[PDB]
Amino acid sequence: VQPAGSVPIPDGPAQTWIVADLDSGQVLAGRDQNVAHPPASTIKVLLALVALDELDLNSTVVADVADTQAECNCVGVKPGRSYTVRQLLDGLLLVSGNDAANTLAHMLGGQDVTVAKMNAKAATLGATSTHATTPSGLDGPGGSGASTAHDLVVIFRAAMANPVFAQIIAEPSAMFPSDDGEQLIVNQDELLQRYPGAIGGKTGYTNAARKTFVGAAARGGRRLVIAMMYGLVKEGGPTYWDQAATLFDWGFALNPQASVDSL
């Protein structure tokens, strides 16, 4: 659970969580880090990994009508318009665009083959408790899907190893093509502004998943990665931003030579 002799970790709304070293892969602490829950939009990180593995950032696609129809939220993809893989990754990661997700899946061969590719990729990473049902993290034909706090940081750790991902996820904003003729899209990960040394994160929410989060931070040459699942913020209670900051602060204060397990 945590190293013998370390100080208490303050509780927060997230029901499962884990704190790991992003570079060493060592686990510092966890609560039910292997219990499965729906991932919501944290799974968009797994989608981004498949896109980065298979698609050139300069490659383009002309969106279909089906690409542009999706449940909240959307970046604003429009039918008949052209988009680069980089632009779709911006929409996917900065504002959690489900149309961007749809459109990337189009490029990877459709919804079904994209989900299959995502599940194959998770297996190769050792994320063996993860089952995506949609590219977006929305509910789909197979239901809400599944992952675990452990599997989420494994997936995020692999994404952070790609410097393209590390850059996009930490981007404050980007310019996205619109029908007049560019719109500023702003990174929704508030940890970037709330917690110094934060280097990126992905939030998620559905009714089935409740709130989810996976992200990383750096302090003095040390880098940590955390994931948090299945939480609801109560009025006057700690937020996901509070708990993320507390987990990072606990982890950086921990003896740098201490760990409880390996990813």
Numbering used by the authors: 29 to 291
What does the paper say about this structure?
Here, we presented structural and phylogenetic analyses of two meropenem-sensitive Mtb penicillin-binding proteins, Rv2911 and Rv3330. A search of the Mtb genome for Peptidase_S11 Pfam family proteins (PF00768) yielded two hits: Rv2911 and Rv3330. The active sites of both proteins contain the three typical penicillin-binding protein motifs: SXXK, SXN, and KTG. The structures showed similar overall folds containing two subdomains.
Because the wild-type Rv2911 was poorly soluble and failed to crystallize, we undertook extensive construct optimization using the GFP folding reporter method. Several rounds of directed evolution to improve solubility yielded an optimized gene sequence carrying six point mutations. The resulting A113V, T197I, N208D, G289D quadruple-mutant protein was named Rv2911opt. The Rv2911opt-PMSF structure was determined at 2.0 Å resolution using multiwavelength anomalous dispersion of Se-labeled enzyme. Rv2911opt was bound to a molecule of the nonspecific inhibitor, PMSF, carried over from the purification. In both structures, the inhibitors were covalently linked to the serine of the first motif (STIK in Rv2911, SVIK in Rv3330). In the Rv2911opt-PMSF structure the conformation of the inhibitor was not unique, and the electron density for the phenyl group of the ligand suggested at least two alternate conformations. Neither conformation appeared stabilized by additional enzyme-inhibitor interactions. Cys100 of Rv2911opt was found in a disulfide with Cys102 from a symmetry-related molecule. In the Rv3330 crystals, Cys77 residues from adjacent molecules formed a disulfide across a two-fold axis. Of the four mutations in Rv2911opt, two, A113V and T197I, were buried, while the other two, N208D and G289D, were exposed and participated in a crystal contacts.
